[PDB]
Amino acid sequence: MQPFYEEYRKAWNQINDHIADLQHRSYARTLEQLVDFVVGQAERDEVLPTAALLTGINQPDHLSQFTALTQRLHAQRAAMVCVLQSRDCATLKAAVETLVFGLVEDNAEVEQLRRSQCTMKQLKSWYTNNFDSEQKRRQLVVILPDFECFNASVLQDLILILSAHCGSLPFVLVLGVATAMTAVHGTLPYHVSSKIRLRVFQTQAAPTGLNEVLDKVLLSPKYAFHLSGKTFKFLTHIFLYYDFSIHGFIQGFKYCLMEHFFGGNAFALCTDYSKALGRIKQLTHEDMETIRRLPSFRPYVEQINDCKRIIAVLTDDDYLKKKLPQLLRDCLLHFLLFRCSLEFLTELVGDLPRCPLGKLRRELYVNCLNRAIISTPEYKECLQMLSFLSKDEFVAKVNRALERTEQFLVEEIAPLELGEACTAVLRPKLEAIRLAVDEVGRALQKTLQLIETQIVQDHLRALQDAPPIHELFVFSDIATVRRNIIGAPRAALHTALNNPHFPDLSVVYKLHLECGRMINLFDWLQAFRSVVPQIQARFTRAVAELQFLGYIKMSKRKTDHATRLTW
């Protein structure tokens, strides 16, 4: 296969695995708690016990949770679980059938009929036959991932049936609820609620998880691929303002990465410094061309003396392919230093009130990639704010910053190649600052100035002011991807119907706009005739097209008048 695709696959899999690991870590606690609760019931009437999970407003993200809980409970050999999707429980019959069949299949899965004959009696008999004297009872768990989408009657009758059959069967059921328990209490009456005895369980919301994955993954120095501030902000925007879908973020990110690496073989260089050189060896003239064509290369071809070298670059590929291992080196090292600098500045800017420049590392990342930090008044304000605390607070603060960046350098840069370099470049500055702190009103501004010139100025540079060929590792071109992901068709239809970018329909649309809210067909036709047997047919088909699009509706509010639905 192509190299860029191989790098794409590798990167994507790494990232996905990382995110998956983070999610597993996030779920592990509540999971263990749930299992503990289930076995707790397994140990030691008339009422079935239940556990409510407050997974608010992201139903499709927390299926892996229940799946993991299934796997864990199966691993525990403590119980067998069936899951009932509100779509499979339109009626009570379908619910009980799906339940029994599910449990049977689950047992079949663990041990390693048809739905038409899945009665509760058959389940009870089956349970009695397989294991009634274990002696330690198993448990029948019944997961309801989508509590909000359930039918009240079916749910109540189901809960009543399950509650009735307790003692003889050890039933348990978990309630994956989006809204608070108010929905549970609102959906169920008291004579049904008096058979539940629930225990509320909480899971971290999507925002915290996003901050986590963002902080731990996209900002990790391990990955050579980076998102531009605008893209980063766009994803976090569409996440925080619309769907709280981690999945949607992951997929958008995936689309960005895919869209990025599909630029050509030239972007195969976006890898560890070691794996890139082979690709440099493997590159071809077209790749040299496309890496020549991109920005931040002309300024590099401009800033240079001895024009024979300039022509050597522009003409000879083999000579340009000798600069790559230095340019790439500089870029990777630069972004390494960049993250290492973020880790330090964020501790210094975050704690402050107002939070003008940023509070989280992602905010700084965006704000730094977008524009220069020194030019913006937020940074100046931050300095103005920093120069007032003084005393043990400031010292302790800068100390926390230094300790943090140090720990980060030891933990997150050591194992990485080019880590010796980054450490060798950054550590002495941290030492210098540490001394400048150990020296500590004037030495304060001295220390701040030192921090500014040693870190912020040279490391936390913007995207405009970035190493030669800062591309490949960074992905801009947010507009196209944005258009391809977001999907705002009505605007396209509007602009396509107003003035064709490339026309009876358009005229009919224009009149349709000119009208107001309700439209007599005759004068509409006459106007359309004023602008332009055959014509009538044209008009009819046009109106039918408008009807098909959904801009106009055939109303009966008046004799032969159409009502437009658009504004």
Binding site: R292, R293, R298, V301, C307, K308, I310, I311, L314
Partner: peptide, 19 residues
């Protein structure tokens, strides 16, 4: 600005530098 025109321009500047 186009890439080929830029390349040609720098090439011309080089040919001018050689002179």
């Amino acid at each position: 600005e186009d890439y080929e025109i830029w390349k040609a321009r720098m090439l011309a500047k080089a040919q001018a530098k050689l002179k």
